[PDB]
RNA sequence: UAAUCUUAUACUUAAUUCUUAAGUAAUAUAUAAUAUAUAUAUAUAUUAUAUAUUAUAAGAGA
RNA sequence: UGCUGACAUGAGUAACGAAAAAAAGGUAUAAACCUUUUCACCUAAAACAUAAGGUUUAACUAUAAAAGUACGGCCCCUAAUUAAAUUAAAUAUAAAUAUAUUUAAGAUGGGAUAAUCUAUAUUAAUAUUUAUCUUAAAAUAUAUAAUUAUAUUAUAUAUUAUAUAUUUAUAUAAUAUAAACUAAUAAAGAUCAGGAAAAUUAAUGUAUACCGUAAUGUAGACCGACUCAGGUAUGUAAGUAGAGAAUAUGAAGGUGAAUUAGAUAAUUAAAGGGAAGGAACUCGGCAAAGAUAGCUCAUAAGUUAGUCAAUAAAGAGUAAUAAGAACAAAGUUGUACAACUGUUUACUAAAAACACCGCACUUUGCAGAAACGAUAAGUUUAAGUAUAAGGUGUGAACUCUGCUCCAUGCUUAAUAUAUAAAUAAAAUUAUUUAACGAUAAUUUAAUUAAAUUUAGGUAAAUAGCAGCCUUAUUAUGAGGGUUAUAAUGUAGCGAAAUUCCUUGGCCU
RNA sequence: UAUAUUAAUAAUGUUAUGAAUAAUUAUUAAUAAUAAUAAACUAAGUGAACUGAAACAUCUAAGUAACUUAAGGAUAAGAAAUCAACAGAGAUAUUAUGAGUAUUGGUGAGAGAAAAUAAUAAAGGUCUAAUAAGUAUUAUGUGAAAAAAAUGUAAGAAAAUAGGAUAACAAAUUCUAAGACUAAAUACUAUUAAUAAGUAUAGUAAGUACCGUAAGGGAA
RNA sequence: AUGACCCACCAAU
RNA sequence: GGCUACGUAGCUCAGUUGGUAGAGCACAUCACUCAUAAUGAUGGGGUCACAGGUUCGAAUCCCGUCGUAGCCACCA
């Protein structure tokens, strides 16, 4: 069993987990979203 | 028990009909396995299934492979009635609540043989894995070299004792039970 | 046991709708009291009176 | 082993990541690019279609053309599930939030019509798996009021002739192949009992949205830090062979590669062959070697009766007699341990560990035992109800499972039995006051818990299970004697994975 | 689907024995929606561990970090039931001094006021309440190391002839809880201005390249 | 002659 | 090997928290019996295994030898 592919691209699940959206809806994620606002960032999210 | 197709089965919960009524003068049919009528009928000492617990509610006892109860007694007026349930208990069932005559089906689900970890899993049966077995860290069993029991009383992950600890206990205990379930 | 407590399941004014009131009506709970009376009791029914417009049902129960 | 940067050394060293190349010409420039030709490798693929993914990697900017029928999405509807949503007072909660209900979301699934092409709109009403056997029937030989015979066996199509309608229409009979495989069908075996959710005609419409569309997809175009022998979903997948998608080949297709050219010392890897031996090797037959159909027969001991054993082993026929593809096929027996089929240390341990089926114990009556729950509501247990659920030990079955509650717990009953908080009281107290009074302390009557103690019970709870001496001429020790315990190791079994001494004695 | 709807009308227009039915278009009326908006400071709820104690459990760390919620330009506090002491002072806040002092502490580590005196500071006093009870108090479990006020449970007053304050008590003294408001001096941000024995590794790029599935990290 | 030995007792219908 | 308990009347077992010169059984001597053996009634033996030491007095005690199950068990 060789091990380095933990990543398995899936669009889709990648936005649901990951996506502005996701991160808007949720409380948490929310924060998140506003704590990378402040820090400067220009990518909040997938 | 003996309830095999095109037999004809009775309700008595909503009083005795009205056709029997126009025709002692019929308890006996009234009696007859499968048929549903208040223990406020039931001959004392009918072999039972079914038991409720309240006057306006489901059958909630006995109700399993082979499972038999019977009215042990019928207290007229306080409005109860000692029964003897599967485990061997004298409860307080209201008087006026369903019963219905007749020992439940399967009389044999007890001699069934589930010989394959398969058909466990079929049933829904993840595995048990033993405290003894494990670490420490996970069961009060667990831990020790080679196999042992670790001079710990028989008790659950969680450190309730196995073996005779009454869990059901002090303030918090059955109010209807007349006399407890015979024990070991 | 109306302490706790489980479970289950019309209309007239006034201020399309809605709320208040009053008037009756209606239901029901009884009361006032009679009816026809029977085994001092009573089936009731009654006009009339009280007075309503979370209940009820089941279980537990100071 | 300071940090950043630069640059050294190893060193022009190792390596250039499974491989088949040649030539001729593009092009008096080409090992490496294109073209032609030869050769080769892959072929139930290195092929052709695709899914997912992605620096567009493409046969590219003058670019991947869709009203729908073997187009998908979008859309309609749901599953698992999700949700600052939902419902004087939905319930619960340091806040966060959580729960329950509703409601909206959620494809991996469902979803109308159609080549004799097709019309979705608005309005009025009113299917777990698995099988396709038998038998019977129709048919060609027999033989020709037979028995055999072996094949046929539900479906789909054109043709011919009719027949009904008038050259369509449809019915009707007529001939017509082997093997697969497929779709609609029917009838049918088991236990493990097999998703959800979204009307009808009739009338009237319908000037057809958007979005994916390349190439790549067993890989140089995704994941693996690399153009990485790893990982990566699906249908196809010449023929000839065969039981088969096995194995050989390979029509067509697609390849021949960011190293070549020589050389082939020692030496290493990967192979082939090997005289006479024949396990002498060695920790140990590790590795290698070994196959006298693969079909059809035939197949023991034992045993839980299961061709389990067993694909038995050997042996046999079909083929073969010097031998003359690949591929499946690799002996037997004793012992320990585990019943089994399984599981496990992804990257050193696959077992003698785990699991298991069975067995027992034990809790819990269901407004339940268990578990979770800053802690609740509540949820799972279960739309289950003691033949159930939870816990616990042992781990199929035969033959069997002896003794003890000491300890420790559990359990039961005792008004045995200490004590904690909680009271009206009023009293000695003090201290203060001028006394009144006030503020403390302190006793003292009432109804004492659980607990422990103590007595049961409970060891398939947790646990536990003697010694000495002496004895039938010697030996042994039935017997005898003492003592001691809660009980005193019972039946098995025994130098065992348990044996120190110990390479125990004896046997093969 | 507000280039909508509901109309009403205007007109070409239809089924229809003008006439009631609709089809546009056109007017007019009337009917709706339109959250990106900071961070810091402040207040409140919850509340650590390392560490300190040369260990360590009390204690510290520390009501700090952290998480939650909410408010404003600030907020908080604020006009005495405060202190004091037989004299007296007169809201609150910040700083100095008092003072590492009284107090306190496994009397260890350690923690630590106030009065008063000055600074700063603004107009700094002022009705808003028909005067404050399940409150004063008390008992009890807690409770800013000192210094208390609060709070769960439960008992529970009194009218100024009163009530808070001091183990207690007696004197005396002071003040009015259970109703209120309050600039300015302050925190923070941003800007302008001025000064820099500050920065060219604190001198403009970049939260970019890039690493990570992600929060996050983070160049030259 | 044969011919060294013999051993058990407990309480009623 | 300093290092825990045990060395008894012929046999077994004593005794314990001192207030010490026990038990049966075996043996000898009677008896009982026809003769044994049981049963019965009569006597036997402790240096309570050796040193030394204490309270008034240790089987007991302290104080350790000649004696009884013994002691190996941080290995890479």
Excluded at chain 2, 43 to 57: E, M
Excluded at chain 2, 100 to 128: C, F, M, Y
Aim: charged residues 25%.
């Amino acid at each position: 069993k060789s091990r380095g592919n933990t990543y398995q691209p899936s669009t889709l699940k990648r936005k649901r987990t990951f996506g502005f959206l996701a991160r808007a809806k949720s409380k948490q994620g929310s924060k998140i979203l506003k704590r990378r606002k402040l820090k400067g960032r220009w990518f909040l999210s997938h | 028990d003996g309830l095999r197709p095109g037999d004809v089965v009775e309700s008595f919960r909503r009083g005795i009909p009205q056709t029997l009524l126009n025709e002692a003068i019929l308890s006996v049919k009234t009696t007859q396995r499968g048929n549903c009528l208040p223990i406020s009928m039931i001959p004392i000492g009918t072999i039972i299934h079914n038991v409720g617990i309240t006057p306006v509610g489901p059958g909630k006892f006995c109700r399993s492979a082979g499972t038999y109860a019977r009215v042990l007694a019928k207290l007229p007026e306080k409005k109860k009635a000692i029964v003897r349930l599967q485990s061997g208990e004298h409860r307080y069932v209201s008087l006026e609540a369903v019963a219905t005559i007749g020992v439940v089906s399967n009389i044999d689900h007890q001699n069934r043989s589930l010989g394959k970890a398969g058909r466990s899993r079929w049933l829904g049966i993840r595995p048990t894995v033993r405290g003894v077995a494990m670490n420490k860290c996970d069961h009060p069993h667990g831990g020790g070299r080679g196999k042992s029991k670790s001079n710990k009383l028989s008790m659950s992950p969680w450190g309730q004792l196995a073996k005779g600890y009454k869990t059901r206990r002090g303030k918090n205990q059955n109010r209807m039970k007349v006399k407890d379930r015979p024990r070991g």
